[PDB]
């Protein structure tokens, strides 16, 4: 059902020096 994050759906989300989610599937997260 995806229970880990809520970032949105379109082209780009950012994720740089500090994150406010649990782990995520993005660039340095997994
Ligand atoms: Cd996230
Ligand atoms: Cd993200
Ligand atoms: Cd993240």
Curated annotation (Swiss-Prot):
Residues that coordinate or bind a divalent metal cation 1: 5, 7, 21, 24
Q: Which residues carry this modification: N-acetylmethionine?
A: 1
Q: Where is this region: Beta?
A: 1-29
Which residues make up the binding site for a divalent metal cation 2? 7, 13, 15, 26
- The residues the record assigns to binding a divalent metal cation 3 are 15, 19, 24, 29
Coiled-coil region: none
Q: Tell me which positions the record assigns to the signal sequence.
A: none
Read off the domain note: Class I metallothioneins contain 2 metal-binding domains: four divalent ions are chelated within cluster A of the alpha domain and are coordinated via cysteinyl thiolate bridges to 11 cysteine ligands. Cluster B, the corresponding region within the beta domain, can ligate three divalent ions to 9 cysteines.
Function (record text): Metallothioneins have a high content of cysteine residues that bind various heavy metals; these proteins are transcriptionally regulated by both heavy metals and glucocorticoids.
What's the family? Belongs to the metallothionein superfamily. Type 1 family.
Question: Which protein, by its recorded name, is this?
Answer: Metallothionein-1
- The record lists the organism as Mus musculus
């Amino acid at each position: 059902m995806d229970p880990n994050c809520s970032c949105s759906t379109g082209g780009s989300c950012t994720c740089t020096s500090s994150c406010a989610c649990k782990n995520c599937k993005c660039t340095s997260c997994k």
